[PDB]
Design a protein around this ligand. Structure first.
Ligand SMILES: Cc1cn([C@H]2C[C@H](O)[C@@H](COP(=O)(O)OP(=O)(O)OP(=O)(O)O)O2)c(=O)[nH]c1=O
Ligand SMILES: Cc1cn([C@H]2C[C@H](O)[C@@H](COP(=O)(O)OP(=O)(O)OP(=O)(O)O)O2)c(=O)[nH]c1=O
Ligand SMILES: Cc1cn([C@H]2C[C@H](O)[C@@H](COP(=O)(O)OP(=O)(O)OP(=O)(O)O)O2)c(=O)[nH]c1=O
Ligand SMILES: [Mg+2]
Ligand SMILES: [Mg+2]
Ligand SMILES: [Mg+2]
Lengths: 474, 271, 241
């Protein structure tokens, strides 16, 4: 705080470092020494300019604190003044790493250190562009941490290209490789380092193993109720978005719960339901009677009879014997956190997002379209990063003229309600239509990205006594 | 001052003029707009699921092998393994992704490595893995790789009105300074009256999402249309919408899809 | 009367040509031919008029806008014929025929360059090719250019664009460009002196018949349909019919 501390007025001494692994000759060469002020021994490093004049002290205690004695610039490097050229420099992260590298080479290669570290490296590298122009190769030697990789990624932009090489280490940095006897690896990473490879670009030649293992694993997961759906779309796949549409009360949820039953029972996949039309008391209740080929909630006489005889526990045990059903009950930020907890932690493979029109209309926004677009692209980014089968349910809008959508109207692809990016970022669109013959439902495949065949996929019938979607003939 | 006289400019004009890249399939394009040139930003437009990626992938495949120029992709929409498998299947005439029993054959026969080194044997193709960071990556590809064709697969997911105008001015300044051939895919807006774009509706230049400067800062716009719920779903119509260098616009030709192989090949059709 | 226009000879029949101190705007859509129409007036005011012309190609480079002039003066579509670009490389005789004088001055912060072209060079026709790459920043720029044109008295021709129509056909298919269709703000139809619009049926029977519309005139005042020009794809000159 006061001024540059002189070694005479602070009882200075140039000695070795036993617990770090640095002899006294390298500390005599650089200028790292120890003062005795305020009783406790304080270590101190010296900053010089390009000429060689002392500009700053840096004082560290026994409990790893920092203390600048005065004006701290950004164009001041720890270890810069000793060299004024050369063919190869090694840039470190901390300050003991410079002593570590100059210990093992007997002062033969120019080694500099940063004055801020990895937090403010871009500021001290942008102002130091002119010092690195007189050099021929630059070897960056940072930590093997997240902040170290971020600093070596973001600090190689302001430097001249073609000279910046990055080395890897099995330690944290150079000092643990100096302590643990790994003095044979750090001497090879200086002379032979890794060339340019920024994250984001991938060469087409060095991709053989990933393409080899990628066509080995997924694929499959057939549908149910009809054959033409699997004849045209070839099932549901990881990383896709299948969007099922209908009118009002046309059977857009019954088909999805039937597919959830077939995918949770016949194939053994963990299924995560996000039902927002009803509570969790109902969407786990109808599956019992649907597996037992009846209508459970739609008959009051059978409810008391299965309460009395104890058959309800038998029906609960024969269905939910495995942990294959994860329910959810009802901002748009925490819902994706729930889906990430269902995908990463518990391990779901089929995630159903029912009735999306009450997560874009229940949020307070002035403009609905940008919110729908941002939600859809963030959900697609989630489904592409994790790679999970994701079914999403949305609705239709009002026609301009003619019949209504709930009386046999053939739907078009522009009838999706809310925006026009619901069909641009979805991977399969299935529409269900019927006419109130009140049970003849037809399936229209509007868009398929995997195959190409669209149009009428088939016909089904809804059973009013059991609750299944049976295939018909017509 | 940075003014330029037209008197002391003789050698710069003489050294400048000392056709360009051609399109594969629908040979009425390179007769009408006279092929692709350096410093161009080409726009590709169609409806939802009409074959924009399918059309641009064949152009990448035919500019990566028969011309010998470096090709840089940017698949912002999907993973690089999918587009790599699609390129490998498309060059060897055999539809690979949409066949399950054929993918497991070539990994155990050992001829997959015979397919891999035939087309990726050179350092031609360079893939990208998913605002200013993407521009920095593309500028790094152009500087330290020297690629001639750069493909941007989906511009709608880049937007996370003036934010699109600034991006388009920045891409135009990049393609003007570096002189790289840039291909950009963009989408159409929701029609408010009549049929949809997927049932053969003539696409105008008005239908562009986001802003209105997508047609004021680009050099050429190619639209593709095809009747989806119709009699045949593969006969496409190609429409040139704007060309600064030639000017002649309109209907170019017709192509079919060839469901077995996947090559967009031209065919004959009167009207 | 002042400066005359070459092609569409109903303009100087209606607004009596251009005059000093004016701000001329050409408003058309994408693919209508705004740069070719202003290029022709740049060519016809540098050799037949004898006036110093200051260009500002903010949209294109300086190599294309010079080769375009060299080709257009010699009746040859130059930049699009590959065989003729290597046949003539007689090129220096074509070069010193129109660049042998000190008439044309191209351009590769902008107002300082324009004030240096007016003061230090003596240019009387300043052409600004693209304005959209530069509500406050547009109107402030228009008032600064208006104060500059009032202080100096230089003819100024600036290209701007049209907005996106919300109902009906587009501007590229025969819709008449009204006075409302201007981007940025509403001061573009209040601070200029004349507005010339070009209309041509792109997706039509013939794409090479442009109609010219006058939208405003502070001297004569009469507006409406001017005439009809053809393009002559072999040559490239907009000629009236
Ligand atoms: C498809 C179909 C449904 N139904 C009955 C079963 C159910 O009681 C009801 C539809 O079941 P739901 O799936 O609950 O209705 P929905 O999802 O279409 O409506 P919403 O948009 O509000 O979510 O109609 C028939 O009777 N015949 C049929 O063909
Ligand atoms: C071009 C074409 C594609 N197809 C089908 C089969 C192809 O595997 C599939 C590929 O279409 P895509 O290229 O994936 O469609 P897209 O990229 O334009 O749409 P998006 O914005 O969602 O990315 O389309 C046909 O059936 N007939 C055709 O003529
Ligand atoms: C006027 C006219 C131009 N053309 C052609 C010649 C040129 O290739 C092109 C000229 O149009 P441009 O002058 O380039 O149009 P623009 O400047 O308004 O738009 P932008 O630069 O953003 O694209 O059109 C014709 O074919 N017939 C015509 O009548
Ligand atoms: Mg429902
Ligand atoms: Mg695509
Ligand atoms: Mg122009």
């Amino acid at each position: 705080t006061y001024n540059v501390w002189n070694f005479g007025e602070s009882n200075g001494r140039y000695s070795a470092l036993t617990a770090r692994g640095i002899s006294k000759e390298t500390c005599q060469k650089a200028g790292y020494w120890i003062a005795k002020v305020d009783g406790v021994m304080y270590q101190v490093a010296d900053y010089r300019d390009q000429n060689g004049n002392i500009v700053s002290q840096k004082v560290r205690d026994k409990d790893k604190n920092f203390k600048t004695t005065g004006s701290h610039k950004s164009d001041a490097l720890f270890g810069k003044h000793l060299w004024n050229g050369g063919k190869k420099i090694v840039v470190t992260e901390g300050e003991i790493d410079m002593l570590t590298v100059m210990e093992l080479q007997d002062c033969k290669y120019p080694v500099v250190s940063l004055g801020h570290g990895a937090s403010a490296a871009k500021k001290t590298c942008a102002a130091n562009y002119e010092y690195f122009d007189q050099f021929e190769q630059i070897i960056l030697m940072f930590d093997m941490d997240e902040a170290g990789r971020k600093a070596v990624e973001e600090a190689a932009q302001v430097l001249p290209a073609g000279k910046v090489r990055v080395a890897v280490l099995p330690c944290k940095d150079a000092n643990e490789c100096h302590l643990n006897g790994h003095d044979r690896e750090i001497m090879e990473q200086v002379w032979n380092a890794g060339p340019w490879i920024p994250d984001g670009v991938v060469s087409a030649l060095s991709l053989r193993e990933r393409i080899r293992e990628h066509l080995s694993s997924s694929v499959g997961l057939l549908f149910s109720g009809c054959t033409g759906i699997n004849d045209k779309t070839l099932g549901a796949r990881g990383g896709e978005v299948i969007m099922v549409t209908s009118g009002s009360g046309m059977g857009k949820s019954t088909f999805v719960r039937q597919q959830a039953l077939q995918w949770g029972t016949a194939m053994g996949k963990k299924v995560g339901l996000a039902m927002l039309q009803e509570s969790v008391e109902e969407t786990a209740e109808d599956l019992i009677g649907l597996h037992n080929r009846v209508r459970l909630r739609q008959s009051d006489s059978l409810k008391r009879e299965i309460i009395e005889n104890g058959k309800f526990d038998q029906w609960f045990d024969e269905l939910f014997g495995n942990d294959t059903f994860h329910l959810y009950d009802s901002e748009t930020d925490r819902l994706l956190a729930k889906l990430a907890y269902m995908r990463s932690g518990l391990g779901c493979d089929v995630i159903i997002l029912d009735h999306i029109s009450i997560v874009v209309s229940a949020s307070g926004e002035s403009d609905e379209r940008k919110m729908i677009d941002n939600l859809m692209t963030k959900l697609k980014g989630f489904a592409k990063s994790t790679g999970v089968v994701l079914v999403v349910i949305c609705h239709l809008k009002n026609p301009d003229k003619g019949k209504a959508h709930e009386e046999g109207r053939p739907v078009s692809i522009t009838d999706l309600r809310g925006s026009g990016a619901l069909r641009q970022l979805s991977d399969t669109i299935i529409a269900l239509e019927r006419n109130q013959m009140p049970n003849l439902v037809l399936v229209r495949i509007l868009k398929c990205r995997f195959t190409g065949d669209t149009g009428i996929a088939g016909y089904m019938e809804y059973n009013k006594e059991t609750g299944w979607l049976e295939p018909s003939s017509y």
